[PDB]
Write an enzyme that holds these catalytic residues in place. Structure first.
Site, PDB file in Angstrom:
ATOM      1  N   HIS B  29      -4.515  -6.244  36.976  1.00 59.36           N
ATOM      2  CA  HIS B  29      -5.944  -6.494  37.147  1.00 59.36           C
ATOM      3  C   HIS B  29      -6.582  -6.975  35.851  1.00 59.36           C
ATOM      4  O   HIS B  29      -7.368  -7.931  35.859  1.00 59.36           O
ATOM      5  CB  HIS B  29      -6.651  -5.235  37.651  1.00 59.36           C
ATOM      6  CG  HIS B  29      -8.125  -5.411  37.845  1.00 59.36           C
ATOM      7  ND1 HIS B  29      -9.034  -5.256  36.822  1.00 59.36           N
ATOM      8  CD2 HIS B  29      -8.847  -5.758  38.937  1.00 59.36           C
ATOM      9  CE1 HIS B  29     -10.253  -5.480  37.277  1.00 59.36           C
ATOM     10  NE2 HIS B  29     -10.167  -5.786  38.559  1.00 59.36           N
ATOM     11  N   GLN B  30      -6.257  -6.327  34.729  1.00 60.21           N
ATOM     12  CA  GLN B  30      -6.786  -6.773  33.443  1.00 60.21           C
ATOM     13  C   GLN B  30      -6.278  -8.169  33.093  1.00 60.21           C
ATOM     14  O   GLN B  30      -7.030  -9.001  32.567  1.00 60.21           O
ATOM     15  CB  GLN B  30      -6.418  -5.774  32.348  1.00 60.21           C
ATOM     16  CG  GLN B  30      -7.517  -5.547  31.322  1.00 60.21           C
ATOM     17  CD  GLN B  30      -8.669  -4.730  31.875  1.00 60.21           C
ATOM     18  OE1 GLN B  30      -8.482  -3.606  32.340  1.00 60.21           O
ATOM     19  NE2 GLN B  30      -9.871  -5.294  31.825  1.00 60.21           N
TER      20      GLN B  30
END
Lengths: 298, 187
Positions: B29-30
């Protein structure tokens, strides 16, 4: 007959201290002397305890101290003198064949990568480990590793790793007294939650004096992940050195008593029936001897 | 979208695979937030619907340029000891297509009581009588527990796989890799 003694307690070697935690900023870790300590605080969600890094910090400072004792073969409590003499002779032959060489290399590896940062290493983008050989209060031989280059599943060779390994071997053999101050630095992130040991407010965390910390036995268990000679399948890596090869995470036990691979049967036929096992298996037996135990019949 | 990258979970003697899945999902996600783009699809090749098990294998779906942009990002550091990384191979042509969607729930009544306090200016007992404590939503869906950098509260994100179709049309993708109308192949 030379049967196993009814009490065969062993004191543990490789004594780990309680691993403190502290908050610091990267590129300032060379002055890591008066950093603040990570504190467990109470936040109600039901009341629970949480520990997280402060806002103006990105590095954890897990620090502990390790004593390498030696005399792993001598039991603290024994009944049979003949059994004690036979076990001491067997350990003497093991030491003469190899002088704590491979076991010390694996312990030096497990010190090199911050596996003792259990859940503070998977989510960290950069982990650095500093190991000092303090003598008479002064650092006699300083080390500095990077935990990312040293994997958790391979046991390679390196010059600094060989120096640390021969230090560990000298400590385990009894040729000298070895005291190690291990300082680890991990870039867990800005304000990310840390994972100290858990105490038994539904869940509470471990602290010693207003500072979150990891239990000594957790550091010892992380240092016992040197066992790779079990009948591995499905690609499992090194596991903690335990009797009956027990791993709680997998919920199953390797080296079953049905097979000729648990610590007790190999110890027995190595010292009772003189059936010396394989070199890797005898390394596992001496690892169980180093970790100590309450071994012995009833 | 024609390519895919397969991630297998190495068994871990210290961690069950669920929290490893959560950690890697937060890392990806990051990575997607930093990289950007709306053409990244997630897949659970061994998703078990009998016990809502996440599985022990991960498949990420993207294009060749998107996949090389993802693997070029240094997010992969600190997680190689527990995963496999294969090759960005082309997905098989005869594959049924299914969608992935994040299904949230209103499991906490007091959040909605605070919301209606900010919307209708009702009192405590009015919200208590209007909203009973039995309106909590229980989902028998696989989930991952994560905390966000924006808000430090730990949030649970359910992932559900849609029915198998025979074709897929163009759609978008969220920051988590979940489809807002897109599809991923099944194989």
């Amino acid at each position: 007959i030379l049967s196993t003694a009814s009490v065969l307690a062993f004191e543990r070697k490789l004594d780990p201290s309680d691993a403190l935690m502290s908050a610091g900023a990267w590129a300032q870790r060379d002055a890591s002397q008066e950093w603040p300590a990570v504190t467990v605080r109470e936040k109600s969600v039901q009341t629970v305890d949480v520990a997280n890094l402060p806002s103006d910090a990105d590095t954890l400072k897990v620090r502990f101290t390790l004593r390498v004792l030696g005399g792993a073969g001598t039991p603290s409590a024994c009944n049979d003198a003949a059994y004690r003499d036979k076990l001491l002779q067997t350990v003497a032959t093991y030491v003469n064949d190899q002088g704590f060489a491979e076991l010390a290399r694996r312990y030096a590896h497990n010190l090199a990568n911050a596996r003792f940062l259990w859940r503070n290493r998977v989510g960290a983008e950069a982990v650095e480990v500093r190991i000092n050989h303090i003598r008479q209060g002064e650092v006699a031989r300083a080390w500095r590793f990077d935990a990312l280059a040293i994997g958790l599943r391979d046991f390679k060779a390196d010059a600094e790793l060989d120096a640390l390994a021969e230090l560990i071997a000298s400590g385990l053999s009894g040729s000298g007294h070895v005291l190690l101050e291990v300082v680890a630095f991990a870039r867990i992130g800005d304000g990310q939650e840390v994972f100290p040991s858990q105490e038994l407010k539904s869940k509470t965390l471990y602290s010693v004096r207003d500072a979150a910390a990891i239990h000594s036995q957790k550091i010892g268990n992380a240092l016992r992940t040197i066992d790779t000679w079990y009948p591995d399948e499905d690609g499992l890596g090194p596991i903690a050195v335990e009797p009956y090869g027990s791993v709680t995470s997998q919920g199953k036990a390797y080296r079953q008593p049905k097979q000729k691979l648990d610590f007790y049967t190999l110890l027995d036929n190595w010292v009772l029936r003189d059936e010396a096992p394989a070199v890797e298996q005898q390394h596992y037996v001496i690892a169980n001897l180093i970790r100590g135990g309450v071994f012995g019949e009833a | 979208m024609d390519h895919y990258l397969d991630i297998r979970l190495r068994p871990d003697p210290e961690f069950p695979p669920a929290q490893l899945m959560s950690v890697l999902f937060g890392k990806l996600h990051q990575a997607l937030v930093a990289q950007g783009g709306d053409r990244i699809g997630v897949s659970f090749p061994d998703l078990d619907e009998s016990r809502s098990r996440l599985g022990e294998r991960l498949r990420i779906h993207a294009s060749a340029d998107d996949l090389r942009a993802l693997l070029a990002r240094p997010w992969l550091e600190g997680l190689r000891d527990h995963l496999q990384f294969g090759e960005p191979a082309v997905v098989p042509h005869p594959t049924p297509y299914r969608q992935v969607s994040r299904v949230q729930a209103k499991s906490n009544p007091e959040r909605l009581r605070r919301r209606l306090m900010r919307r209708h200016d009702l009192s405590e007992e009015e919200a208590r009588k209007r909203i009973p404590d039995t309106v909590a939503r229980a989902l028998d869906l696989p989930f991952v527990t994560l905390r966000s950098q924006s808000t430090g509260q730990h949030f649970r994100l359910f992932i559900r796989h849609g029915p198998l179709q025979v074709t897929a049309e163009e759609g978008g993708f969220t920051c988590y890799g979940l489809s807002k109308g897109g599809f991923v192949p099944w194989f």
